Design a protein around this motif. Structure first.
Motif, PDB file in Angstrom:
ATOM      1  N   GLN A 327       0.891  -1.372  -0.078  1.00 16.63           N
ATOM      2  CA  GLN A 327       0.049   0.096  -0.156  1.00 16.63           C
ATOM      3  C   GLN A 327       0.736   0.851  -0.008  1.00 16.63           C
ATOM      4  O   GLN A 327       0.431   2.048  -0.999  1.00 16.63           O
ATOM      5  N   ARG A 328       2.020   1.134   0.554  1.00 19.42           N
ATOM      6  CA  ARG A 328       3.104   2.243   0.794  1.00 19.42           C
ATOM      7  C   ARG A 328       3.229   3.319  -0.261  1.00 19.42           C
ATOM      8  O   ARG A 328       3.589   3.743  -0.621  1.00 19.42           O
ATOM      9  N   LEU A 329       3.659   1.645  -1.173  1.00 20.72           N
ATOM     10  CA  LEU A 329       5.330   1.739  -2.046  1.00 20.72           C
ATOM     11  C   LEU A 329       4.385   2.265  -3.534  1.00 20.72           C
ATOM     12  O   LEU A 329       3.943   3.183  -4.413  1.00 20.72           O
ATOM     13  N   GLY A 330       2.520   1.333  -3.840  1.00 19.55           N
ATOM     14  CA  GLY A 330       1.431   1.144  -4.654  1.00 19.55           C
ATOM     15  C   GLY A 330       1.148   3.070  -4.015  1.00 19.55           C
ATOM     16  O   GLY A 330       1.367   3.703  -5.883  1.00 19.55           O
ATOM     17  N   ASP A 331       1.194   3.710  -3.626  1.00 23.68           N
ATOM     18  CA  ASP A 331       0.919   5.044  -3.271  1.00 23.68           C
ATOM     19  C   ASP A 331      -0.068   5.491  -3.529  1.00 23.68           C
ATOM     20  O   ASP A 331       0.062   6.597  -4.834  1.00 23.68           O
ATOM     21  N   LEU A 332      -1.765   4.512  -4.072  1.00 22.08           N
ATOM     22  CA  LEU A 332      -2.390   4.944  -4.862  1.00 22.08           C
ATOM     23  C   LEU A 332      -3.333   6.175  -4.972  1.00 22.08           C
ATOM     24  O   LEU A 332      -4.029   6.542  -5.702  1.00 22.08           O
ATOM     25  N   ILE A 333      -3.014   6.123  -3.579  1.00 23.54           N
ATOM     26  CA  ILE A 333      -4.106   7.851  -3.702  1.00 23.54           C
ATOM     27  C   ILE A 333      -2.575   8.737  -3.477  1.00 23.54           C
ATOM     28  O   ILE A 333      -2.297   8.009  -2.300  1.00 23.54           O
ATOM     29  N   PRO A 334      -2.297   9.692  -3.860  1.00 22.48           N
ATOM     30  CA  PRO A 334      -0.917  10.048  -4.085  1.00 22.48           C
ATOM     31  C   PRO A 334      -1.243  11.297  -3.479  1.00 22.48           C
ATOM     32  O   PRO A 334       0.018  12.138  -2.179  1.00 22.48           O
ATOM     33  N   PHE A 335      -1.756  12.361  -3.798  1.00 19.99           N
ATOM     34  CA  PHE A 335      -2.670  13.725  -2.639  1.00 19.99           C
ATOM     35  C   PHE A 335      -3.976  13.685  -2.279  1.00 19.99           C
ATOM     36  O   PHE A 335      -4.469  14.657  -2.125  1.00 19.99           O
ATOM     37  N   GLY A 336      -3.805  12.720  -1.571  1.00 18.75           N
ATOM     38  CA  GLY A 336      -5.150  11.825  -0.804  1.00 18.75           C
ATOM     39  C   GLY A 336      -6.773  13.326  -1.949  1.00 18.75           C
ATOM     40  O   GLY A 336      -6.577  13.163  -2.667  1.00 18.75           O
ATOM     41  N   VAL A 337      -7.161  13.281  -0.972  1.00 16.66           N
ATOM     42  CA  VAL A 337      -9.063  13.610  -1.599  1.00 16.66           C
ATOM     43  C   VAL A 337      -9.026  14.867  -1.363  1.00 16.66           C
ATOM     44  O   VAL A 337      -8.815  15.059  -0.222  1.00 16.66           O
ATOM     45  N   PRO A 338      -9.074  16.267  -2.390  1.00 22.32           N
ATOM     46  CA  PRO A 338      -9.731  17.205  -1.186  1.00 22.32           C
ATOM     47  C   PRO A 338     -10.418  17.339   0.022  1.00 22.32           C
ATOM     48  O   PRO A 338     -11.534  17.348   0.195  1.00 22.32           O
ATOM     49  N   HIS A 339      -9.680  18.026   0.437  1.00 23.67           N
ATOM     50  CA  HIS A 339     -10.664  18.580   2.141  1.00 23.67           C
ATOM     51  C   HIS A 339     -10.703  20.334   1.974  1.00 23.67           C
ATOM     52  O   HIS A 339     -10.596  21.061   1.174  1.00 23.67           O
ATOM     53  N   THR A 340     -11.802  20.793   2.999  1.00 25.44           N
ATOM     54  CA  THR A 340     -12.366  21.583   3.089  1.00 25.44           C
ATOM     55  C   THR A 340     -12.040  22.310   4.694  1.00 25.44           C
ATOM     56  O   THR A 340     -12.234  21.135   5.452  1.00 25.44           O
ATOM     57  N   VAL A 341     -12.063  23.160   4.782  1.00 27.22           N
ATOM     58  CA  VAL A 341     -11.448  23.491   5.937  1.00 27.22           C
ATOM     59  C   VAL A 341     -13.198  24.160   6.379  1.00 27.22           C
ATOM     60  O   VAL A 341     -13.215  25.410   6.717  1.00 27.22           O
ATOM     61  N   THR A 342     -14.114  23.794   7.732  1.00 25.97           N
ATOM     62  CA  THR A 342     -15.678  23.678   8.032  1.00 25.97           C
ATOM     63  C   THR A 342     -15.680  25.288   8.585  1.00 25.97           C
ATOM     64  O   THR A 342     -16.932  25.572   8.673  1.00 25.97           O
ATOM     65  N   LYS A 343     -15.005  25.865   9.249  1.00 19.47           N
ATOM     66  CA  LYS A 343     -13.836  26.959   9.554  1.00 19.47           C
ATOM     67  C   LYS A 343     -13.428  28.294   9.200  1.00 19.47           C
ATOM     68  O   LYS A 343     -12.760  27.414   8.274  1.00 19.47           O
ATOM     69  N   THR A 345      -9.901  29.221  10.002  1.00 28.73           N
ATOM     70  CA  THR A 345      -8.858  28.101  10.474  1.00 28.73           C
ATOM     71  C   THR A 345      -7.689  28.666  11.392  1.00 28.73           C
ATOM     72  O   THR A 345      -6.819  28.691  10.668  1.00 28.73           O
ATOM     73  N   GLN A 346      -7.027  28.899  12.325  1.00 27.97           N
ATOM     74  CA  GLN A 346      -6.204  28.925  13.004  1.00 27.97           C
ATOM     75  C   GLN A 346      -5.048  27.250  12.383  1.00 27.97           C
ATOM     76  O   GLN A 346      -5.365  26.244  12.871  1.00 27.97           O
ATOM     77  N   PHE A 347      -4.025  28.076  11.830  1.00 29.08           N
ATOM     78  CA  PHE A 347      -2.772  26.843  11.792  1.00 29.08           C
ATOM     79  C   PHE A 347      -1.642  27.396  11.671  1.00 29.08           C
ATOM     80  O   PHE A 347      -1.622  27.992  10.636  1.00 29.08           O
ATOM     81  N   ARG A 348      -0.050  27.136  12.440  1.00 26.44           N
ATOM     82  CA  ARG A 348       1.267  27.684  12.328  1.00 26.44           C
ATOM     83  C   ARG A 348       1.061  28.747  11.836  1.00 26.44           C
ATOM     84  O   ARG A 348       1.980  28.565  11.212  1.00 26.44           O
ATOM     85  N   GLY A 349       0.894  29.390  12.758  1.00 21.77           N
ATOM     86  CA  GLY A 349       0.181  30.936  13.130  1.00 21.77           C
ATOM     87  C   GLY A 349      -0.478  31.737  11.424  1.00 21.77           C
ATOM     88  O   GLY A 349      -1.169  32.362  11.780  1.00 21.77           O
ATOM     89  N   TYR A 350      -0.883  30.148  10.783  1.00 23.85           N
ATOM     90  CA  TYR A 350      -1.674  31.188   9.290  1.00 23.85           C
ATOM     91  C   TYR A 350      -2.840  30.462   9.228  1.00 23.85           C
ATOM     92  O   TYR A 350      -3.603  30.217  10.374  1.00 23.85           O
ATOM     93  N   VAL A 351      -3.766  31.227   8.955  1.00 30.43           N
ATOM     94  CA  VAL A 351      -5.036  31.481   9.265  1.00 30.43           C
ATOM     95  C   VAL A 351      -5.484  31.119   7.763  1.00 30.43           C
ATOM     96  O   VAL A 351      -5.112  31.970   6.301  1.00 30.43           O
ATOM     97  N   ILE A 352      -6.609  30.122   7.551  1.00 30.93           N
ATOM     98  CA  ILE A 352      -7.272  29.435   6.536  1.00 30.93           C
ATOM     99  C   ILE A 352      -8.190  29.664   6.417  1.00 30.93           C
ATOM    100  O   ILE A 352      -9.424  29.216   6.965  1.00 30.93           O
ATOM    101  N   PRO A 353      -9.473  31.185   5.396  1.00 29.23           N
ATOM    102  CA  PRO A 353     -10.322  31.393   5.215  1.00 29.23           C
ATOM    103  C   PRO A 353     -11.345  29.743   5.245  1.00 29.23           C
ATOM    104  O   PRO A 353     -10.936  29.247   4.472  1.00 29.23           O
TER     105      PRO A 353
END
Ligand code: HEM
Ligand SMILES: OC[C@H]1O[C@H](O[C@H]2[C@H](O)[C@@H](O)[C@H](OCCCCCC3CCCCC3)O[C@@H]2CO)[C@H](O)[C@@H](O)[C@@H]1O
Ligand SMILES: OC[C@H]1O[C@H](O[C@H]2[C@H](O)[C@@H](O)[C@H](OCCCCCC3CCCCC3)O[C@@H]2CO)[C@H](O)[C@@H](O)[C@@H]1O
Length: 460
Positions: A327-343, A345-353
């Motif tokens: 599974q690891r090497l197959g890496d068959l979903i390599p950039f995962g599936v898009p997400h959004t932030v429901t609010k 959001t505070q993250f690592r100094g940055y703010v994500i609308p």
């Protein structure tokens, strides 16, 4: 306040600082210059990318509801439109996930395993018949992965030959090819301009629509045959919950969530599983010694007079560790599936609308050299302690993390195990290409290895 990242141009966005190779390869390149967490502009859209086992976990686990928001995929939103378990959000999503998780577990009254073991038994029986003549597994592995979903939603399976099934199947899995093509990925960036001109979208559209018809029909056949007191499968149940929300119209359980949810299950839980199997066997052709040891583990922990069972896994830590590394090497979903932030959001100094899209490069985790000694090399070792027992690993998130974590990890786990141990239990393999010369180098929202011929040699 957004993560750093190269300057957008309107209309086009970061079109220019991208790599022709592809969406994945583009991100990883930006990661080098702009770091673990950057913002990249897909035309109008600002996307924030999460590279690494920490970045990804910090969002998906340490901030899981913030990041529970699903995002769109351009070529298929015209089909899914926010409906169905996969592309749902907010209330819509939760009630659908709550449901499916519960429902698929129970009804479908043969247990999810058993249905798999049956499906594998058929596979053995079908494979036997080719008497060890070269073949491309692709089809069969689509077939078994599809027959599994089918069993869940429709309360039935299909013969590997029945040609209606194959016609539909064929054109289902043509869609993925197209879904992961270059054209699709360009479409992703500029679908507002391209939806008017011909292109693979229209083709993808009509392939899925065509399915949503057969499903439509299986739904109409289900209502007209329904036994409420003894449901058979997922649709029977969704229907019974549909009538139990008759009086309520802000309820989520309407015809359109049924259809696009059944489709959704096929769409997530087939190719990806199947390609993992396809890829798995490819690796067993290339490094036979692994296969030998797996066949060997099978001989000790299972013998040769009983089928594999899901319980045999706990005692087969090597095999299990192979499947992990596959599974690891197959890496068959390599950039995962898009997400959004429901609010917001505070993250690592940055703010994500709020609602900003978030892409968790899962591949960057899969090849995290802090959690895997030899990340570009196939190595079961990655999952085995000094005593040869299974080893957990933070960098192992092929099914992703958080609340959007693969709903099916499980079937797929059980599938991968029972198909692998059962096939190998009964057949050794071989092929035209010598192991030394087999090449693995595949890329889209799903990766795919090359096509290959293979031989399933019955053993007595
Ligand atoms: C090797 C097999 C599989 C892999 C690697 C896999 C991987 C994934 C990943 C990475 C996601 C998205 C996680 C995220 O939100 O970032 C996902 C979503 C999903 N998968 Fe799978 N999956 C597999 C098989 C299956 C199967 C067999 C089913 C169903 C029987 C299934 C059902 C789902 C569903 C419903 C979602 C939507 C997640 C959500 O919106 O909550 N998957 N899968
Ligand atoms: O004068 C035009 C310039 O074009 C190129 O510059 C950049 C450009 O930004 C660009 O032209 C090109 O980048 C390749 C990006 C191609 C986009 C294709 C993507 C489409 C969607 C997702 C997959 C790939 O090459 C260089 C990469 O930085 C070339 O470097 C030179 O030809 C020249 O400097
Ligand atoms: O009265 C029952 C009738 O139904 C039978 O099977 C229908 C079977 O109900 C129905 O099972 C069959 O379906 C074949 C298509 C299955 C497609 C499922 C795909 C969805 C997407 C991913 C790949 C799998 O279509 C058949 C042909 O119309 C036969 O059609 C008839 O002979 C029979 O009389």
């Amino acid at each position: 306040k957004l993560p750093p990242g190269p300057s957008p141009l309107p209309v086009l966005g970061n079109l220019l600082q991208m790599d022709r190779k592809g969406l994945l390869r583009s991100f990883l390149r930006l990661r080098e210059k702009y770091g673990d967490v950057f913002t990249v502009y897909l035309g109008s859209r600002p996307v924030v990318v999460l590279c690494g086992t920490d970045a990804i976990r910090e969002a998906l686990v340490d901030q899981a509801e913030a990041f529970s928001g699903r995002g769109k995929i351009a070529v298929v939103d015209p089909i899914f439109q926010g409906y169905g378990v996969i592309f749902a959000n907010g209330e819509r999503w939760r009630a659908l996930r709550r449901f499916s998780l519960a429902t698929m577990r129970d009804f479908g009254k043969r247990s999810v395993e058993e249905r798999i073991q049956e499906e594998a038994r058929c596979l053995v029986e079908e494979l036997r018949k080719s008497k060890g003549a070269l073949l491309d597994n692709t089809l069969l592995f689509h077939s078994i992965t599809s027959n599994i979903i089918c069993s869940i939603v429709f309360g039935k399976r299909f013969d590997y030959k029945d040609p209606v099934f194959l016609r539909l199947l064929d054109l289902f899995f043509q869609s993925f090819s197209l879904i992961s093509s270059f054209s699709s990925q360009v479409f992703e960036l500029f679908s507002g301009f391209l939806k008017y001109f011909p292109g693979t979208h229209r083709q993808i559209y009509r392939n899925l629509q065509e399915i949503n018809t057969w499903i439509g029909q299986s739904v109409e056949k289900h209502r007209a045959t329904l036994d409420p007191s003894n449901p058979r499968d997922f649709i029977d149940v969704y229907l019974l919950r549909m009538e139990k929300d008759k009086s309520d119209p802000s309820s989520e359980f309407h015809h359109q969530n049924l259809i696009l949810t059944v489709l959704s299950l096929f769409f997530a839980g087939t190719e990806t599983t199947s390609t993992t199997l396809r890829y798995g066997f490819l690796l067993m052709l290339k490094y036979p010694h692994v296969t030998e040891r797996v066949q060997k583990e099978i001989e000790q922990v299972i013998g040769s007079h009983r089928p594999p069972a899901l319980d045999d896994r706990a005692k087969m830590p090597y095999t299990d560790a192979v499947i992990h590394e596959i599974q690891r090497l197959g890496d068959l979903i390599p950039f995962g599936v898009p997400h959004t932030v429901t609010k917001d959001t505070q993250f690592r100094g940055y703010v994500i609308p709020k609602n900003t899209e978030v892409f968790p490069v899962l591949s960057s985790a899969l090849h995290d050299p802090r959690y895997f000694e030899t990340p570009n090399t196939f190595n079961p070792g990655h999952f085995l302690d000094a005593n040869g027992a299974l080893k957990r690993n933070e960098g192992f998130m092929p099914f992703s993390l958080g609340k959007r974590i693969c709903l099916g990890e499980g079937i797929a786990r059980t599938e991968l195990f029972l198909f692998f141990t059962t096939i190998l239990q009964n057949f050794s393999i071989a092929s035209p290409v010598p192991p030394e010369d087999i090449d693995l180098t595949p890329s889209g929202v799903g990766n795919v290895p090359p096509s290959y011929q293979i031989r399933f040699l019955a053993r007595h």
